[PDB]
Design a protein around this ligand. Structure first.
Ligand code: CLA
Ligand code: CLA
Ligand code: CLA
Ligand code: CLA
Ligand code: CLA
Ligand code: CLA
Ligand code: CLA
Ligand code: CLA
Ligand code: LHG
Ligand code: XAT
Lengths: 218, 201, 737, 41
């Protein structure tokens, strides 16, 4: 298998079982000696998968309204950059059907339900399919792997029928999640130093690369 | 053991075995680990529930009718500042004496059950209850719905307990709403229904 | 290297006092059990012999200490926002006394709410928090409230961390013994990054706000700190170099930043403190130096040094094997590290106390005499206590953890083989210094009493000039332009430059002369310090054995005696040597603080007039009156105590009450020190008899205090009374004048 | 909790509570009737 900045200490426990495993662990955080707290290989893998999925959702979300605005498809009042759409009211705000703090409570309640159910699945596997939950507990039984629950709800199309195909799709998901996390970091830091939309950054760079660049922006 | 729990997937405390009505295994701090505290807390919860239901009715029904104009009763917040036929301390003393006689016999039944079930004046009259907290008898249970199979009793007591908890929450909410918004509880509901998006804290 | 859930969180151990010990947990047959419960509360080594458990217990208590400190800081910041006249003081620092405490009127105690200026009534504080807040750019009370809220949050976080790292995930022993990583992190991150962050804050917030304040602008009209960051035009107007941005830094054109990064030296005439640009440059340089220093010790990547390798390479023909084996001692015993750290911290505290007064770092601090005196005395006392604790824990390590069979060290072995010569030489030095330092005072007193002023050791009859210190003062006064070309003025105004700084009609700092009296007082200081060192080192060296008691190590570190045999063996333990050295530490620190107070009141502090004539507080009588003991008794103790004994009926009556209270507490301690246990045990027997007569005899039999407990109570009450007396006297004297 | 109630009956905690209540009562009494030198009733 290919290796990327592998080390003798890292290779003692990264044998390639996990998806997207290249032996990269210079700091040795996944060292399975004295595991505890939040420093644990299984929890770290689960956190990486979850963060990658959320960044994949967020990477396209922060750019989707922007590119259609320059394309003349949606009204210009809704084609705002991610940092002005109301996330930071000092940076700009937009009036929705309810005030931002009211939306925050509803979002917190719904996400609390979802994340508490997920966490309780993680702590004691197979628990969510026992107690009556509007009759929806039949499909929320999980599959024994916390990061890949499957089932009729989370796997409607029935993808990954073949084990090798499932392995390949898991590898693609991991790679795309890492790329999305890098893209999100780029989003944040580019917005910090330029103050304009990332799509505008790309358009400015394509206008000319020698005048709109790191050497000219910093 | 298979009853629904407040926190699905968790393990209920040992001292809560689901025998009591309205039992969902919610006791994070273990305030009723020993049985005596369990009995005392059950009695306190029952009393709080009934008082709260009476208070919720007396707060919300009068205020609803005043808004629509059938009656012209004052606000429940300021109902204590009106002038009545006598000084308020006299009414407080009368209340203290009467409720001291009433609650005094209730204290004895908790400590020593089955000792205050007889009429002091006319011995022919007795209370028919057998459980602490449910006195029974013709005085308190005239319709006779308080005795029967254990399933019926458990269902009825669970209904009473849950309704009492809801009433406690509603009364606390009304008090804090009047503290903060400075307006009647019914007005708050109409304001919320007018603009649900923005009529908020 | 952590363990999942080592110890269950329960209230079971709360209901069983003394669970940490097998003997104490049995039950209170007598009253000695209650006292033994508290004396062994934090001795983790006695509870168990496992090093990992002791390390885990030690790690958690520091979190509680940090939480307590954060709560203290939160209270200090909150009181300055709600019960203070900080805003009024900000517009007139030279005529308003800081105050941050008010009193409820109940029993006539509202007289303590004296007038302090700014339309406020309260107690005048001398902790110097107002100057710190001004130097940080704080203007309103909202910022103080936010700081208090943040400190409360940090205290809660520290408490939660303390609970977590003991009941949920406790680190293993191998984690604690990573000394190289700990040193690297505490050098690069804790110190260097903190200095860098403070330098950034001073550059971006303190400098413009302080410049606006020194310009005389109303504090309510000064732009908020965030306005200097969002609007670079304001900073460019204040400092033109800010218009270029960070380009000069990355092109090594650092000369452009000379406007706000200077090397001036001296004091700011407007405020009387150091230039803030100098402080910012100093913090930047210190951050760079500490960041470089944190990359020395080896870690998982090969490059660096091994502390064991460094230690093992140093040995000499006089010392044998040298430093081999010292690495294992310092990585296995908690007491030796504690002793070393305590000694270093005490020395650093004394150095800080000496440095703060002659180089005022805060605005309007030099002209606040009470704050200066309070800070000096407080830091000196703290340093002395820490220094004593160092020797105490060194003796503890010597008694307990010393083991030549498995932890042999050549340097420690050689010291223990010639301790007699060290002790005898130190004894001779102490006797010589005592004779030739204090004896000159008695000679002066006798000659003055006999009517022969021409035969005294004084500046007019027989001079004893400190020629060496005067040479240092002359060299430092001429340092700029010769040996420090980049400096404009000297580091301190006390070197003897000749320039005087006056702020608000008062003298901030000026050259301090040295004469015959300074010689005598400095040699007195040396004598006292040498005696204290002698006592502590004799206690440490003879902790295990001596010619009198060969098996002293078997009796332990804290035992009263070994009977009346061999003529008497009272106070032979190492604990008794600390008990005896505390008195000498008290003596030395009291003499030092008296010297400081009299010298500053007589030769430095004062008022200046329009024509520029200085009138000191006491009129410069230190030179001719301090050469005799009668002079110290009369012109210092008798003359300066009229402020505290005449404070009744005014806002300073609390100091007058504390004077007598501390007198009583100090005098009360002599009962425990001069008496013995047998008399009090025999007296109790008669008292118990009458209780038995009336059926009121307790089952917990009353017992007299042990010998060690009695000595500890005596020394504690003695120190408390003396320090409280000196505190009340100093504050009452310095607040009024 | 029985063990929590046991810890509240230990001597220092009970003494602290008793003395705090006592001091509060005395302070309130002196606040209501200040500067008392003789018993007038
Ligand atoms: C949702 C409201 C609610 C419900 C479902 C119940 C239901 C019940 N109550 Mg009840 N109660 C309530 C509110 C309620 N209560 C309030 C607000 C008070 C305070 C005035 C009381 C005071 C009360 C007493 C004093 C007694 C009951 C009793 C009973 C039980 C028999 C009475 C009965 O239903 O026959 C109708 C007759 C039954 C389980 C009796 C019981 O359990 O003993 C057998 C009894 O003695 N209740
Ligand atoms: C049965 C409980 C109950 C109910 C139905 C309401 C209902 C209402 N409250 Mg309210 N409130 C409650 C308890 C309750 N409160 C309590 C206990 C407090 C004290 C913290 C408050 C404090 C409060 C303030 C300060 C304000 C309201 C306001 C309002 C109104 C606008 C909605 C809103 O912002 O709610 C916000 C509600 C909360 C912050 C409390 C949390 C909700 C509690 C825990 C009950 C949860 C509901 C329950 C679990 C669901 C099942 C019951 C359902 C059938 C109703 C609305 C009519 C606002 C108003 O006047 O409208 C114009 C307003 O300004 N409430
Ligand atoms: C830990 C250090 C510390 C110390 C020594 C004090 C000391 C004091 N505080 Mg205090 N305080 C602190 C931290 C501290 N506080 C913190 C962290 C906060 C929250 C930010 C407060 C909030 C606070 C308020 C709000 C008040 C005091 C008051 C007082 C004074 C009266 C105390 C009293 O009656 O309590 C009695 C003891 C009880 C347990 C009650 C007293 C000088 C009072 C005062 O000065 O009023 C004139 C007052 O009103 N404090
Ligand atoms: C860790 C401390 C720290 C932090 C967080 C910052 C942070 C910042 N500095 Mg900065 N700075 C620092 C230390 C720091 N500085 C030090 C020590 C110096 C002296 C060499 C400077 C000199 C400096 C200049 C000259 C400028 C900044 C600027 C800035 C801002 C844009 C980058 C940013 C808020 C720029 C700014 O104000 O842009 C708004 C700017 O022009 N800084
Ligand atoms: C970083 C600082 C530090 C740390 C962590 C320790 C830690 C330790 N020291 Mg120690 N020590 C220190 C500094 C320190 N010391 C200093 C500076 C000195 C010199 C004064 C000493 C002198 C010293 C001696 C002499 C002894 C220790 C001992 C010990 C060990 C047991 C502690 C114990 O049981 O105390 C229990 C704590 C108390 C009983 C509290 C004391 C109460 C104080 C003195 C009175 C405060 C008065 C107060 C203002 C009045 C209010 C009262 C209120 C109720 C109204 C422990 C490992 C003992 C040891 O190792 O024995 C084997 C021992 O005998 N230490
Ligand atoms: C309720 C308990 C109790 C009672 C009935 C007595 C009774 C007596 N004591 Mg006494 N004593 C007590 C507790 C008690 N003592 C305690 C706890 C101490 C230690 C501080 C002493 C120390 C003491 C001395 C040193 C002397 C007496 C003497 C005497 C006798 C002279 C009368 C007198 O007022 O002396 C004065 C009584 C005192 C100064 C005691 C102080 C008051 C204490 C602190 C009260 C504490 C009560 C305790 C907390 C009970 C808790 C009750 C709770 C569980 C409900 C008298 C028989 C004298 C005597 O004749 O010698 C035999 C004498 O010289 N006592
Ligand atoms: C600022 C508002 C305020 C007011 C108006 C009062 C008023 C009173 N307090 Mg009080 N108190 C307050 C704040 C206040 N307190 C605070 C902040 C504390 C600290 C938490 C206390 C702690 C305290 C104690 C510990 C005691 C009082 C008591 C009393 C009563 C004394 C009269 C009495 O004994 O008669 C009899 C009582 C009444 C007529 C009514 C009660 C009186 C009604 C005393 C009391 O009630 O005695 C029984 C008493 O012991 N107070
Ligand atoms: C055995 C000694 C003793 C005696 C008999 C008294 C007696 C008295 N003191 Mg007192 N006191 C004493 C010691 C004593 N004190 C000590 C040692 C202190 C210092 C802590 C005080 C501090 C004190 C204050 C601050 C006050 C009293 C007051 C009083 C009077 C109480 C008035 C009231 O209603 O209650 C009463 C004559 C009160 C008073 O009005 O006195 C006239 C009052 O305000 N005392
Ligand atoms: C005597 C001159 C000062 C001392 C001196 O020459 O220091 C240096 C001298 C020789 O040291 P070595 O080179 O043998 O060992 C140096 C150590 O750092 C090796 O671990 O020290 C001694 O011989 C012991 C002195 C004890 C103290 C003696 C009285 C002072
Ligand atoms: C009980 C209550 C609050 C409950 C608190 C809870 C949930 C605590 C929960 C937990 O403990 C558990 C379960 C388990 C533990 O491990 C953890 C915690 C989390 C600690 C509210 C109200 C409790 C009590 C109430 C509601 C009181 C009612 C008042 C009345 C009757 C008023 C009547 C009047 O209004 C009229 C009718 C007309 C007016 O004119 C006059 C007046 C007099 C104003």
């Amino acid at each position: 298998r290919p290796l990327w900045f592998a080390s003798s200490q890292s290779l003692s426990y990264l044998d390639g079982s996990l998806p997207g495993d290249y032996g990269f662990d210079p700091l040795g955080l996944s060292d399975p000696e004295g595991t505890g707290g939040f420093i644990e290989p299984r929890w770290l893998a689960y956190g990486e998968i979850i963060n990658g999925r959320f960044a994949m959702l967020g990477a396209a979300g922060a750019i989707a309204p922007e590119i259609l605005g320059k394309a003349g498809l949606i009204p210009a009042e809704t084609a705002l950059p991610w940092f002005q759409t109301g996330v930071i009211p000092p940076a700009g705000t937009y009036t929705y059907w309810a005030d931002n703090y009211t939306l925050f409570v509803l979002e917190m309640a719904l996400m609390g339900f979802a994340e508490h159910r997920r966490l309780q699945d993680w702590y004691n596997p197979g628990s969510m399919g026992k107690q009556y939950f509007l009759g929806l507990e039949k499909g929320l039984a999980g599959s024994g792997n916390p990061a890949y629950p499957g089932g009729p709800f989370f796997n409607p199309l029935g993808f990954g029928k073949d084990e090798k195909s499932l392995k390949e799709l898991k590898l693609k998901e991991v790679k795309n999640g890492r790329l999305a996390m890098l893209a999100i970091l780029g989003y944040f830091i580019q917005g910090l130093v330029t103050g304009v939309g990332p799509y505008q950054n790309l358009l400015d760079h394509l206008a000319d690369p020698v005048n709109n660049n790191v050497l000219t922006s910093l | 053991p298979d009853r629904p729990i407040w926190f699905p997937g968790s393990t209920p405390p040992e001292w809560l075995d689901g025998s009591l009505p309205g039992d969902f295994g919610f006791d994070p701090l273990g305030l009723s680990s020993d049985p005596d505290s369990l009995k005392w807390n059950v009695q306190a919860e029952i009393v709080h529930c009934r008082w709260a239901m009476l208070g919720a009715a007396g707060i919300f029904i009068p205020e609803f009718l005043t808004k629509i104009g059938i009656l012209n009763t004052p606000s429940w917040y300021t109902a204590g500042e009106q002038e009545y036929f006598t000084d308020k301390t006299t009414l407080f003393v009368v209340e203290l004496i009467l409720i001291g006689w009433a609650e005094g016999r209730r204290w004895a039944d908790i400590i020593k059950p089955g000792s205050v079930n007889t009429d002091p004046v006319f011995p022919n009259n007795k209370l028919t209850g057998t459980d602490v907290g449910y006195p029974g008898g013709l005085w308190f249970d005239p319709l006779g719905w308080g005795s029967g199979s254990p399933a019926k009793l458990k269902e009825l007591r669970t209904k009473e307990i849950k309704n009492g908890r809801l009433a406690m929450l509603a009364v606390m909410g009304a008090w804090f709403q009047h503290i903060y918004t400075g307006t009647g509880p019914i007005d708050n509901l109409f304001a919320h229904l007018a603009d649900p998006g923005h009529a908020t804290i | 290297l952590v363990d999942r859930d080592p110890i269950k969180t329960s209230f079971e151990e709360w209901a069983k006092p003394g669970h940490f010990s097998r003997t104490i947990a049995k039950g209170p047959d007598t009253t000695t059990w209650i006292w033994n419960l508290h004396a062994d509360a934090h001795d983790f080594d006695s509870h168990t012999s496992d090093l990992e458990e002791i390390s885990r217990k030690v790690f958690s208590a520091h979190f509680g200490q940090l939480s307590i400190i954060f709560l203290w800081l939160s209270g200090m910041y909150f009181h300055g926002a709600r019960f203070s006249n900080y805003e009024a003081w900000l517009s007139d620092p030279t005529h308003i006394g800081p105050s941050a405490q008010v009193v409820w009127p109940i029993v006539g105690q509202e007289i303590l709410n004296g007038d302090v200026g700014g339309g406020f009534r309260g107690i005048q504080i001398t902790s110097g928090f107002f100057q710190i807040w001004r130097a940080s750019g704080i203007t309103s009370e909202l910022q103080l409230y936010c700081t208090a809220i943040g400190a409360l949050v940090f205290a809660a976080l520290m408490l939660f961390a303390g609970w977590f790292h003991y009941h949920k995930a406790a680190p293993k022993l191998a984690w604690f013994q990573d000394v190289e990583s700990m040193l690297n992190h505490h050098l690069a991150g804790l110190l260097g990054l903190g200095s860098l962050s403070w330098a950034g804050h001073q550059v971006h917030v303190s400098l413009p706000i302080n410049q606006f304040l020194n310009a005389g602008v109303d504090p309510k009209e000064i732009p908020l700190p965030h306005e200097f960051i969002l609007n670079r035009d304001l900073l460019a107007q204040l400092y033109p170099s800010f218009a270029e941005g960070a380009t000069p830094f990355f092109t090594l054109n650092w000369s452009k930043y000379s406007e706000f990064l200077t090397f001036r030296g001296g004091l700011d005439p407007v405020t009387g403190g150091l230039w803030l640009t100098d402080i910012a440059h100093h913090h930047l340089a210190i951050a760079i130096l500490f960041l470089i220093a944190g990359h020395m010790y080896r870690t998982n990547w090969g490059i660096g040094h091994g502390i064991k390798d460094i230690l093992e390479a140093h040995k000499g023909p006089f010392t044998g094997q040298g430093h081999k084996g010292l690495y294992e001692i310092l990585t296995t015993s908690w007491h030796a590290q504690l002793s070393l750290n305590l000694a270093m911290l005490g020395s650093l505290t004394i150095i800080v106390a000496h440095h703060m007064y002659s180089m005022p770092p805060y605005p309007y601090l030099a002209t606040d005499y009470a704050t200066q005196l309070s800070l000096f005395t407080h830091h000196m006392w703290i340093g002395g206590f820490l220094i004593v604790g160092a020797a105490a824990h060194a003796a503890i390590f010597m008694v307990r953890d010393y083991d030549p069979t498995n932890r042999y060290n050549d340097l420690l072995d050689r010291v223990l083989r010639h301790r007699d010569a060290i002790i005898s030489h130190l004894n001779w030095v102490c006797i010589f210094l005592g004779f030739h330092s204090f004896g000159l005072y008695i000679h002066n007193d006798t000659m003055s009493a006999l009517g022969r002023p021409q035969d005294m050791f004084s500046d007019t009859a027989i001079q004893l000039q400190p020629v060496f210190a005067q040479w240092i003062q002359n060299t430092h006064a001429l340092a700029p332009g010769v040996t420090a070309p980049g400096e404009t003025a000297s580091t301190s105004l006390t070197w003897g430059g000749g320039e005087l700084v006056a702020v608000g009609g008062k003298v901030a700092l000026l050259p301090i002369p040295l004469g015959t009296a300074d010689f005598l007082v400095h040699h007195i200081h040396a004598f006292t310090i040498h005696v204290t060192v002698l006592i502590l080192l004799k206690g440490v060296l003879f902790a295990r054995s001596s010619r009198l008691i060969p098996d002293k190590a078997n009796l332990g570190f804290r035992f009263p005696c070994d009977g009346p045999g061999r003529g008497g063996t009272c106070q032979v333990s190492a604990w008794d040597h600390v008990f005896l050295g505390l008195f000498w530490m008290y003596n030395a620190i009291s003499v030092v603080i008296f010297h400081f107070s009299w010298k500053m009141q007589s030769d430095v502090w004062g008022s200046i007039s329009d024509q520029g004539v200085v009138t000191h507080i006491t009129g410069g009588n230190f030179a001719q009156s301090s050469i005799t003991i009668n002079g110290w008794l009369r012109d210092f103790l008798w003359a300066q105590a009229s402020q505290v004994i005449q404070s009744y009926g005014s806002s300073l009556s609390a100091y007058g009450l504390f004077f007598l209270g501390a007198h009583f507490v100090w005098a009360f301690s002599l009962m425990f020190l001069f008496s013995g246990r047998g008399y009090w045990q025999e007296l109790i027997e008669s008292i118990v008899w009458a209780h038995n007569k009336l059926k009121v005899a307790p089952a917990t039999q009353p017992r007299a205090l042990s010998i060690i407990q009695g000595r500890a109570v005596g020394v504690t009450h003695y120190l408390l009374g003396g320090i409280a007396t000196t505190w009340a006297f100093f504050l009452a004297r310095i607040i009024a004048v | 909790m029985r063990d929590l109630k046991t810890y509240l009956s230990v001597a220092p905690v009970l003494s602290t509570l008793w003395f705090g209540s006592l001091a509060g009562l005395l302070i309130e009494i002196n606040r209501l009737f200040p500067d008392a030198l003789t018993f007038p009733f």
